Amino acid sequence: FPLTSMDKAFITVLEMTPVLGTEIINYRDGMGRVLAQDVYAKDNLPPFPASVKDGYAVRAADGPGDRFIIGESQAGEQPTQTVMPGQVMRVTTGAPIPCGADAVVQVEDTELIRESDDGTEELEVRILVQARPGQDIRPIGHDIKRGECVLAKGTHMGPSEIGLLATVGVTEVEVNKFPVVAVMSTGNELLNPEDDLLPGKIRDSNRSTLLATIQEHGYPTINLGIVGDNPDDLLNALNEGISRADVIITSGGDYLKQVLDIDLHAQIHFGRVFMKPGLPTTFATLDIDGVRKIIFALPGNPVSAVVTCNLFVVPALRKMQGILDPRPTIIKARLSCDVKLDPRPEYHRCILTWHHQEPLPWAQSTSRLMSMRSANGLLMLPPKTEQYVELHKGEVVDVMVIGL
Amino acid sequence: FPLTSMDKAFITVLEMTPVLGTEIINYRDGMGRVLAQDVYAKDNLPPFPASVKDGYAVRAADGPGDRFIIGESQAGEQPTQTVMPGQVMRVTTGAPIPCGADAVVQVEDTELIRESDDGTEELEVRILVQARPGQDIRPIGHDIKRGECVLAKGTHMGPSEIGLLATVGVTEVEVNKFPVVAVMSTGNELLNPEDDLLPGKIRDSNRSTLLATIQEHGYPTINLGIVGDNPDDLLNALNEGISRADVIITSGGDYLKQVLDIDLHAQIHFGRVFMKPGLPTTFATLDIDGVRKIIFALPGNPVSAVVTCNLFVVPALRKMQGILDPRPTIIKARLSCDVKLDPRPEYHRCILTWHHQEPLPWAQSTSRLMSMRSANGLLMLPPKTEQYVELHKGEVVDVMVIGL
């Protein structure tokens, strides 16, 4: 297979990966989902004019002076009295403004004159200021108007978006589906983690690592187990993956390519990338029954598997789930140590760290405390060149965020 | 209640919040968990000397020359032959090195001499180089040694840590428990999201927002519903929370404090914070049956609830689940617009954005594309002072990461 450049490989993954269809879900399951419909309000917020303050709903045209308090409007109740000249109604923040009143005067701008004998009721109050019409009242529809679009299709939902659906009472929404991702490992040397060692064998760690990475991003997964490195077993496992899942990931193992090509008639878009690590990374698509499955065969080395998973698989999954720009976030950071550059673009897991009052983070390449912490970035080193053969501590480089 | 400074409030939450006890879990459930035990390897990795390359396992003392190939060692099998003078054994990467061989010569440093008539077997090969002892062999225990501590207590686990547990076959581990968090809303004006509006009422959004925020961080939650703003109903709901959960969060609503103090005998550590928004935030602890419950009563305003939840609740939860430094990550960013400073420290949701080849991100305070994206930071504005009454676009400020 020819050596594909990193840029060609990445663009190829994004271009060939489909966007999944849509489904209707309950709002509370919306975390990380992308809306496939515009969402409109069916009510005004607030639906009644509401007091912004504790105080009194007044007729501004009465001006300052001594008023009879005819009642109280409290949150959650509809007032039934009309405020007439020389009257006011006590209000609390959020309470509906009664008919007849056109402003609110906050309590600090008043002095109580008389209180019921028992002391439970305010009877008369002096209004010390001249209210302007509308003052301290949130009018109907100030925050949201009926028929307004409050969230657009393409919005990637978090907690506040869920709370907005709640506010407008839209509890069922159309969203893109999440990809189901099947993971298998291939290699005759592999045992399950639960197993004791046997001669010549080691425990499979890549399956757990990859499954955990995908789960961390919120996508459902299928564990396809360890698969013998031979055509028959590979074909059976791939067939199961294709049946159960939208995406299949393998690591290890050239029978894989032979099965994909000759047995499955998949399109293998690249089988080698000019990158370090991850040279042997393979990406294929399969069009079957009107839909497109995507298949990644990652290298068996566990650092390579982790790295290629973050570079190629995660952005594909983000596209599949409807995210409009599925590219990862890249930030600037300072190198923590010198690095000789390789002819290939090189990627290294690191821990981004922000120091007191220093504007750029440091990228620590994986003392006491750093070993307590999971990698949250991928240092992206440029390929070797005439001028640049080495980079030094303190120099600013790109780091892909993969974890903060 | 007296006005507590932000710093005193934050330190108080962290100091008074307990660390939860421990439980044993399966490794695959380890995402985001903190190990409560050191983890030791029970085997060497690799457990046998392994070839780093495709090539031939040789006796370095034979030097270069023409060799008989006596067999092949492949991954997953224990070789049963001993390599003698003038012999070599074909090896693939990861295969065990057979007795008698002390180095590996990569295939590119050889030329095949004879192949079986059928062409399926290599019979003789010319070794073109002088191997050094140990060359291209990963020795037993190179990566991990038996009895080595591979993860320390206090490690906050991600995908690679899970994969490390798999590698060493430690499938059950002691971890700190996750806090169970109960959320309720109080307010006579509130209806469930599922409800049509009635006069004077609005839909409760804070419960969904807060529950989604807590769930986003991985903690189990209990929905305690809308609670009438009166002592009897508040006491019943708080009692249910205390029974079912480690942490209780309310928003809205002064009956709450009265119930906490007089009915529950909770310790209310502060009831007002000098901050904007979030002035009325209340934090209390209750020691009952030998354990400590924590209670937050957040303001009813939905921006305030979100903001105080991120500032005070999330760091408490991170402490409860065993994270050794539970403080949030604060980074430097550039203001996107001018801001007049308030006498209180002020917190505003924003979207952090990194621009092409610019080292610091911009903090966009919540065009087409920004409305598609959830807030991922909290701008932390300094209190007003003699010299500083305003900050301008481009100026560098602190932003708490709450979402990237």
Binding site: M6, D7, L311, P345, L379, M380, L381, P382, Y388 | -
Partner: peptide, 10 residues
């Protein structure tokens, strides 16, 4: 321009 290849230290 976006690139998945690291850039030289500006």
């Amino acid at each position: 321009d976006f690139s998945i290849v690291g850039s030289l230290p500006r």
